[PDB]
Amino acid sequence: MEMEKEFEQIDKSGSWAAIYQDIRHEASDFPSRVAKLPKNKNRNRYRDVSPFDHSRIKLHQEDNDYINASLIKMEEAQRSYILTQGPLPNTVGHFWEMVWEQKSRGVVMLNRVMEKGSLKCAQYWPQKEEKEMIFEDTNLKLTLISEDIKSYYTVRQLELENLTTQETREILHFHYTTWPDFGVPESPASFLNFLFKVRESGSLSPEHGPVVVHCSAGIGRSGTFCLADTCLLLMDKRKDPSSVDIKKVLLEMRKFRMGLIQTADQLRFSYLAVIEGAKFIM
Numbered sequence: 098m099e100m101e102k103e104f105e106q107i108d109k110s111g112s113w114a115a116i117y118q119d120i121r122h123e124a125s126d127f128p129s130r131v132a133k134l135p136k137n138k139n140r141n142r143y144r145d146v147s148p149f150d151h152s153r154i155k156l157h158q159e160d161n162d163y164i165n166a167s168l169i170k171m172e173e174a175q176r177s178y179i180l181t182q183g184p185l186p187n188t189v190g191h192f193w194e195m196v197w198e199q200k201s202r203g204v205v206m207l208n209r210v211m212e213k214g215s216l217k218c219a220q221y222w223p224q225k226e227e228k229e230m231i232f233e234d235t236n237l238k239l240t241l242i243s244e245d246i247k248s249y250y251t252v253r254q255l256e257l258e259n260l261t262t263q264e265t266r267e268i269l270h271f272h273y274t275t276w277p278d279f280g281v282p283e284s285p286a287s288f289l290n291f292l293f294k295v296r297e298s299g300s301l302s303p304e305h306g307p308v309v310v311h312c313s314a315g316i317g318r319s320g321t322f323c324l325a326d327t328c329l330l331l332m333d334k335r336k337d338p339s340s341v342d343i344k345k346v347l348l349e350m351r352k353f354r355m356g357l358i359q360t361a362d363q364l365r366f367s368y369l370a371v372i373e374g375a376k377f378i379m
């Protein structure tokens with residue numbers, strides 16, 4: 098079926114939970130043996146969210162190459178994304194090592210450091226220009242260059258230096274700061290505006306390594322971001338945009354990381370975002 102009318106048909110019939118459970122039943126199951134090794138317990142935020150072995154990002158290290166991160170490669174859309182958990186106190190250096198090694202231009206953050214009165218990820222970037230951060234375990238230096246605070250999101254320019262080689266690179270930090278502590282946003286308008294700002298920066302384009310996207314677990318809000326982006330790109334590329342099937346795209350993405358889209362409300366919000374977005378594109 099088309100999307101907008103399939104949407105109203107699920108609303109009128111109140112069957113979002115059944116649709117979402119079908120997706121959960123059909124989703125791929127691949128091994129994640131490296132994630133479950135005992136030496137990696139303090140590298141995982143949640144015991145039930147792990148990268149598959151076949152698609153995990155490897156750190157360029159011989160001691161321990163493990164990080165909780167996955168490469169999502171969308172062949173028809175010609176887009177790639179790295180989805181990862183919010184960094185932990187003992188993985189902030191690994192996180193920036195990955196950004197460096199994978200040649201990423203942008204980092205997309207969809208959570209606040211504290212939500213619901215608990216810490217959802219480490220404070221992994223510097224908050225003042227004159228107070229830079231050094232990660233001694235991976236030999237990197239990170240400096241805040243500029244910060245632009247807007248009503249729904251903040252954009253930061255960061256400098257990442259590989260202290261071994263003295264090479265430097267400019268990284269863009271796109272921080273969506275207004276996702277509610279509970280539920281999903283009422284309108285997708287600010288989330289779509291944010292997606293378009295990431296696109297306009299070059300961070301999603303083939304001349305760079307894959308964008309790094311995270312929330313707390315790296316599957317819920319993070320899944321919504323890449324699902325909406327890929328669906329909109331396919332609607333622009335194809336002769337028949339009504340042939341884009343958001344459930345089929347989500348199942349393709351779940352071949353590369355488990356659990357993408359965590360609730361039926363997140364599924365409904367993803368439909369809403371693609372529907373409204375397709376009108377603005379034209």
Ligand SMILES: CC(=O)N1C[C@@H](CO)[C@@H]2Oc3c(F)cccc3[C@@H]21
Pocket residue numbers: 252254269297298299
């Ligand atoms: C700020 C600015 O003028 N530029 C030039 C643009 C390419 O010509 C870059 O896009 C961004 C951006 F999205 C955020 C931050 C800085 C930049 C760069």
Ligand SMILES: CC(=O)N1C[C@@H](CO)[C@@H]2Oc3c(F)cccc3[C@@H]21
Pocket residue numbers: 286289290293373374375376377378379
């Ligand atoms: C700002 C911008 O470029 N965009 C792209 C649209 C998707 O094509 C987004 O959704 C809306 C919208 F509904 C109203 C207003 C601006 C937007 C966003």
